[PDB]
Amino acid sequence: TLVEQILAEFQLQEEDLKKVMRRMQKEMDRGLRLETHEEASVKMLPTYVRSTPEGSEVGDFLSLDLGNFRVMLVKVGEQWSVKTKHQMYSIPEDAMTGTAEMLFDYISECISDFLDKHQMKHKKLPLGFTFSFPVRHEDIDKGILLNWTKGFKASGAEGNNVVGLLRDAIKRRGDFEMDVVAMVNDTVATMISCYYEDHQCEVGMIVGTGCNACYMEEMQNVELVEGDEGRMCVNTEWGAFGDSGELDEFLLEYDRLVDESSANPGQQLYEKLIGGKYMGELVRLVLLRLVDENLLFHGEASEQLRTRGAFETRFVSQVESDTGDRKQIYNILSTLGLRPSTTDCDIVRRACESVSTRAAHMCSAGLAGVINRMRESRSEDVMRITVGVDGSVYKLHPSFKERFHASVRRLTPSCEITFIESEEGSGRGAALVSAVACKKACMLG
């Protein structure tokens, strides 16, 4: 009963989800205004991706996705045929700890490997780059890294042109040639990839290691950009929502602990409630509190349970996947150096559920804010929209998307939302934006 009382702190009322949604809407309006942009927690970064007429260039497009690293070859043929090939690459700590130069040298090396395994190192291809970090764009192929997120810390990157860093590393290597045609956020790439299959897709969302959304905003509303005709995609960077104290009445001890011990204290607070980088850690801290209060594992925690990041977000998914026999739960805890009881297993499950349900409900508040804002901007009484979604939390968590879809739909009564689970959106969309941008780019000279 004391266990249940502690887990009940994660609960959120429909009245406070509505408070969060309206606060997100207020923060979104702030990010778009020239007057409040520099102070605004939700940056609402213009992407330079504009509503496009039918079709794109036909051909072979290379895609890079950083934010594991992925190289993708996308074949666009002609009605339309889109075929993909991919390779995954694990980033070594050295490439993460050092310079931006070392990071882009390892990315270049991965590109060479992909080119050799696909018998194409002699081909000079157009390249789309998904770079899943806040970027101030000057165009579709030029953007400066505002700051790292999700524990990324390579020196000499912030304030520099990310496209320039990649081009330099390709030149230093001298093993292949590529035309870097576009750089997009993963939300943007996901939206573009799902748009290919559904033209009503005007929102891209990520629920992975981090959490973010982008959407098609009226050009009239984008004050940081010249023009009043059509629409442009805006990268909300909503992970930073709560950084100017917007979420203070909702933050728990476990949230402030995760934040204090993170690579970016005081930053990405909304994200820190939802993202897979943080989810497992919130659970480990809830479990440690139960152990300290002698309510779980007879007050005896292991050296492994006491280590930061030892409770992987994958364990949270696995725990909530458990059939009922508690065998999955027992095995995770046994490997973690613990000897749990059956009751201990049930406690671990309930803690996992408390953290993930809060993540889904917090996430739905943000997405509803975006959809409700668009409905107003488009003066649509009944707005029919598609949301393209990528990320391991949304895709692989046992009940996250069910809990998330219902909560979004309760906050959006006047909307008909379709959710597309994007299989390879983050990577595929970088190539498709390149294919669309290449109608103009390949003719610049």
Ligand X SMILES: OC[C@H]1O[C@H](O)[C@H](O)[C@@H](O)[C@@H]1O
Ligand Y SMILES: CCOP(=O)(Cn1ccc(NC(=O)c2cc(Oc3cnc(C(=O)N4CCC4)cn3)cc(OC(C)C)c2)n1)OCC
Annotated binding site for substrate: 132-133, 149-150, 185-186, 212, 237, 271
Site for ligand Y, residues 96 to 115, rule: CB under 6 A: none
Of 70 and 326, the one with the shorter C-beta distance to ligand X is: 70
Shortest distance, CB of residue 188 to ligand Y, whole angstroms?
A: 9
Among ligand Y, ligand X, none, partner that 55 touches (CB below 5 to 8 angstroms by kind):
ligand Y
Among ligand Y, ligand X, none, partner that 150 touches (CB below 5 to 8 angstroms by kind):
ligand X
Which amino acid type is present at position 82? V
Of 211 and 435, the one with the shorter C-beta distance to ligand X is: 211
- b/e for 17-49, b at 16 or more Cβ within 10 A? bebbbebbbebbebbbeeeeeeebbbbbbbbbb
Under the binding rule (CB under 6 A), the answer on residue 216 touching ligand Y is yes
What's 251's DSSP letter? -
Which residue in the block uniquely carries the two structure tokens 């130069």? 101
Among ligand X, ligand Y, none, partner that 404 touches (CB below 5 to 8 angstroms by kind):
none
Of 41 and 328, the one with the shorter C-beta distance to ligand X is: 41
Distance (Å, rounded) from C-alpha 355 to C-alpha 316?
9
Q: Which of 61, 129, 195, 419 binds ligand Y (CB under 6 A)?
A: 195
| DSSP codes, 375-418 | HHHTT-SSEEEEEEEESHHHHHSTTHHHHHHHHHHHH-TTEEEE
Provide the edge-to-edge strand list for the sheet that holds 201-207: 45-50, 231-235, 211-218, 201-207, 383-390, 415-421
Of 12 and 184, the one with the shorter C-beta distance to ligand X is: 184
- Contact between 189 and 424 under an 8 Å Cβ cutoff? The reply is no
Binding-site residue ranges for ATP: 65-68, 209, 276-277, 313-317, 392-396
Among ligand Y, ligand X, none, partner that 76 touches (CB below 5 to 8 angstroms by kind):
ligand Y
Of 297 and 394, the one with the shorter C-beta distance to ligand X is: 394
Which residue out of 141, 186, 243, 255 is catalytically annotated? 186
Among ligand X, ligand Y, none, partner that 111 touches (CB below 5 to 8 angstroms by kind):
none
Active site residue 272: no
What is the sign, positive or negative, of the torsion defined by CA atoms of 355, 308, 303, 68? positive
- Contact between 381 and 293 under an 8 Å Cβ cutoff? The reply is no
Of the candidates 125, 130, 90, 87, the one whose C-alpha atom is nearest the C-alpha of residue 106 is 90
Active site residue 186: yes
Each residue 132-161 as x (binds ligand Y by CB under 6 A) or -, in order, gives --------x---------------------
Distance (Å, rounded) from C-alpha 118 to C-alpha 137?
32
Distance (Å, rounded) from C-alpha 350 to C-alpha 353?
5
- Contact between 240 and 268 under an 8 Å Cβ cutoff? The reply is yes
Under the binding rule (CB under 6 A), the answer on residue 69 touching ligand Y is no
Which residue out of 43, 150, 272, 401 is catalytically annotated? 150
Alpha carbon separation from 163 to 4, 131, 172, 190, 419 (Å, rounded)? 50, 10, 14, 20, 31
Of 69 and 133, the one with the shorter C-beta distance to ligand X is: 133
Q: Which stretch binds ligand Y (CB under 6 A): 75-83, 337-345, 371-379, 411-419?
A: 75-83
Of the candidates 399, 385, 302, 297, the one whose C-alpha atom is nearest the C-alpha of residue 352 is 399
Shortest distance, CB of residue 141 to ligand X, whole angstroms?
A: 17
Distance (Å, rounded) from C-alpha 55 to C-alpha 432?
10
Under the binding rule (CB under 6 A), the answer on residue 82 touching ligand Y is yes
Q: Please state whether 58 falls in left (phi above 0), alpha (psi between -120 and 50) or beta.
A: beta
Under the binding rule (CB under 6 A), the answer on residue 56 touching ligand Y is yes
Among ligand Y, ligand X, none, partner that 271 touches (CB below 5 to 8 angstroms by kind):
ligand X
Shortest distance, CB of residue 138 to ligand X, whole angstroms?
A: 17
Q: Which residues are catalytic?
A: 150, 186
Footprint of ligand Y (CB under 6 A): 48-52, 54-56, 76, 80, 82, 140, 191-192, 195-196, 202, 216, 432-433, 435-437, 440
